[PDB]
Amino acid sequence: STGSATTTPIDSLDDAYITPVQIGTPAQTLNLDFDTGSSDLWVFSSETTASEVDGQTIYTPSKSTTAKLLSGATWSISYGDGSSSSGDVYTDTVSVGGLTVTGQAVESAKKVSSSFTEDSTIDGLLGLAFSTLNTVSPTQQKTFFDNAKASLDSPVFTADLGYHAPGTYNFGFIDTTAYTGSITYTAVSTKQGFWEWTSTGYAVGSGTFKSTSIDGIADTGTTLLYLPATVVSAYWAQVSGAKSSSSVGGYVFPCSATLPSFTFGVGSARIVIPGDYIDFGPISTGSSSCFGGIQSSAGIGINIFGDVALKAAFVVFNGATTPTLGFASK
């Protein structure tokens, strides 16, 4: 089997991407944030605290003939930005892009934090990291990908995110028309539950490439590129008037700037992030100070290849017995 679904930016900045997902019988379609940095499929629902729902589409298990309470199971998660959610759990039929998993754990939110409430376009999360990070207790549950894997033509999914445009998530096959050149694969550590890999270095603009190992995670659920302070300083030093602002919470630059590209290494291959991908717009409405798309990871504890980096490539999440990550230009 295979599945193929379009993913669409939620706003003009590509703050996140949503993908339609069918849950239950008759289908209930919710737009979920596919997140390769976590491992819970959770949704806004008929159980969510009413004051915490603001425009989201909700899952109503009582309207699904295939929903079953997973008795006694609860879940609770918090993310690196400090957002969080929790609730109870149902099993139900879930389909993505034509691909169906029966018996999928669907985590029903009873509580969500303000950041989720405020994002009216995101109806929940679909985790695609390793199932060892799933938060359901007392019986840990499998991700959609883990459950689907034995049915797939190939034990892979691919992320092809667009810049200010729709993209695609594919399950079970690699679309050879979606990229240019060849795919370079690189080793993955699953020790922390993430798609954790080691970049071979970087370059700023047309500058020479610096060979240096940078361990990080491939995270579709994180907007920006978070890298060591040394690397990030080297980047922003090439932008007149850029500075790190403690009041804003990171590097800012003059909105009149043209940004240099940023290259990261994948083995002997190179992925180039165009400068415009690194512009996240005014820090506040009408401001002439713009927020940078490359930020320091210092104090996060991990480097994060978020959407800013991933959207510059065609990315293969290879869930074979020895998992690997592939990157191609596109």
Ligand SMILES: CCN(CC)c1ccc(C(=O)NN)cc1
């Ligand atoms: C509103 C809060 N949202 C929705 C954009 C989040 C989505 C994904 C993550 C995350 O850490 N993913 N790995 C964190 C927050």
